[PDB]
């Protein structure tokens, strides 16, 4: 229903959750899923079993848009860094690139301090 051939995988890895977010070769949405919202919502939803199931469950939908291969875009990782990559490729969407642009972020914007933790 789209025959785009090319997808662009924003792997929210993550520190608290897992959301594998596919946009098209231009930049609008294409297909997605998650761990926490699939049945896991609590202190249990970022786990290496969950992060692979997020990617596999994103692939069950993404298939309908006509898309065979992709790059990986890193702009906020966490547990687990390669797990969501392997899992789109397993589920047959070819990883032709990893774009590791990920904002640290750097000193002067000094991100949330939280509990001393």
């Amino acid at each position: 229903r789209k025959q785009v051939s090319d997808g662009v995988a924003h792997i929210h890895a993550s520190f608290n959750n897992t959301i594998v977010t596919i946009t098209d070769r231009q930049g609008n949405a294409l297909g997605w899923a998650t761990a926490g919202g699939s049945g896991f919502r609590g202190s249990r939803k970022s786990t290496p079993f969950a992060a692979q199931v997020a990617a596999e469950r994103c692939a069950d939908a993404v298939k309908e848009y006509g898309i065979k291969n992709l790059e990986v875009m890193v702009k906020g990782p966490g547990p687990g860094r390669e797990s969501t990559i392997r899992a789109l490729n397993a589920a047959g969407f070819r990883i032709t690139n990893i774009t590791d642009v990920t904002p640290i972020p750097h000193n002067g914007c000094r991100p949330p301090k939280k509990r001393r933790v």
């Binding site: 291969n69 390669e82 990559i85 392997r86 490729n89 397993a90 070819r94 990883i95 032709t96 690139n97 990893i98 774009t99 590791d100 642009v101 990920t102 640290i104 972020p105 750097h106 000193n107 000094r110 991100p111 949330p112 301090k113 939280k114 933790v117």
Partner: protein
């Protein structure tokens, strides 16, 4: 920070970016940075390493 895979049978050639940019950049920053007390600590560590 941009790295191909070829024929992609999930090759896992993606590994060499651990040298600095992917992996080393967390010395300061994690939630939160360290804020106070990391400056003389970098050169304190040079003495624990003499072995």
């Amino acid at each position: 920070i941009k790295v191909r895979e070829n024929e992609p049978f999930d090759v896992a050639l993606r590994r060499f970016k651990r040298s600095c940019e992917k992996a080393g950049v967390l010395a300061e920053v994690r939630r939160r940075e360290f804020y106070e007390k990391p400056t003389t600590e970098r050169k304190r560590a040079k003495a624990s390493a003499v072995k």
